[PDB]
Amino acid sequence: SNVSVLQQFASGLKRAKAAKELQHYVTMELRSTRFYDQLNHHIFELERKGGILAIASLIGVEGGNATRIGRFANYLRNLLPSNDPVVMEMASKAIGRLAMAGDTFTAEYVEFEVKRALEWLEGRRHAAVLVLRELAISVPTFFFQQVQPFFDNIFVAVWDPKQAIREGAVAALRACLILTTQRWYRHTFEEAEKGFDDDRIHGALLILNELVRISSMEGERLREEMEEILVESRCCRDLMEEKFDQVCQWVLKCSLIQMTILNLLPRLAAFRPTQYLQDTMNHVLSCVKKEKERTAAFQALGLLSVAVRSEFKVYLPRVLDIIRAALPPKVDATVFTCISMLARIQQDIKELLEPMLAVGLSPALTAVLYDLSRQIPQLKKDIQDGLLKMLSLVLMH
DSSP states (O other): HHHHHHHHHHTTTTTTTHHHHHHHHIIIITTTOHHHHHHHHHTTTOHHHHHHHHHHHOSSOOOOHHHHHHHHHHHHHHTSSSSSSHHHHHHHHHHHHOOOSSSTTTTHTTTHHTHHHOOOOOOOOOHHHHHHHHHHHHHHHGGOOOSTTHHHHHHHHHGOSSHHHHHHHHHHHHHHHHHHOOOOOOHHHHHHHHHHHOOTTTTHHHHHHHHHHHHHHHHHHHHHHSSSSOOSSSHHHHHHHHHHHHHHSOOOOOOHHHEEEEEEEHHHHHHHOOOHHHHHHHHHHHHOOOOSSSHHHHHHHHHHHOOOHHHHHHOOHHHTTTTTGEEEEEEEHHHHHHHHHHOOOGGGGTTTHHHHHHHHOOHHHHHHHHHHHHHHOOHHEEEEEEEEEEEHHIIII
């Protein structure tokens, strides 16, 4: 109905939205629907979670091409003038998923915000960022009006005035452009290499890593494989040297550059196995003394050892001996990830690896131990005895 659904959405204005969606599905989808949508649109034209759950639950029955599109069009066009906080990206994704019942007019609702990509791109970049995220998730039809010029626009347009939204905007535009390209990169790479020489600067480094990932198919495979846990590729000296100088001298002028450098070192290492390797090795040697960053430092060390064979070969004693005394107290998943990724240096881990499993029972610890046993069955009985001891300590009493 309308009144009951309105009350459910009002309660969802606050775990309640999911219960409302489940109950609405169980009641109606087996066997009244448009009244709830009309009331929700009337209220929203002036809550979010419960109303969104109610709108998505009833989606996909009759085949509303314009009636639901028209109801969502007011909110879709309003989101362009006023861009909301971090909830805006997820809300746009939910709206785009719900309106994706197979209508063609959906290419027009976001098109009202599409012109902002050249017009606007907190009231300029974030609205287009949310629209781009929703479209690239469901259908980029509204923002894909310039697909030949998509690479040219994504080269520079993502540096618009946003603090947290700009990085997501770069990612959304890059994802849409990469998917379209699967369906002037060298110039952009050279420009990022030369002009690189701040918080509103690291977005450029993130896009450049995204540019290397999308415009190059060589670095895509390794980046996809390790992320779970033809001419332009030669000119690798300029960008790496510029980034190295930027990190070395002025990192935190206005440790965001540290995260950017760690990300770019991963892109260079996974791209093709110039000065980036030595520069990132020196960066990790410097970040060994860095505080409140060992969680990322261990992950970077593991990624470097897995990808860059030469970097870790001379770096045997510096890093691996540091984390061993810290993990036992209570994060350490990255250290175990590096240990497992080093082999997949053959019999060396047997002597010291015991304390790692002896630390305690954790689901992540169990997953790491299982992955090591599947990957490195050098001493299976050693794993078996520890497993028996842990299982006895747990369930025996």
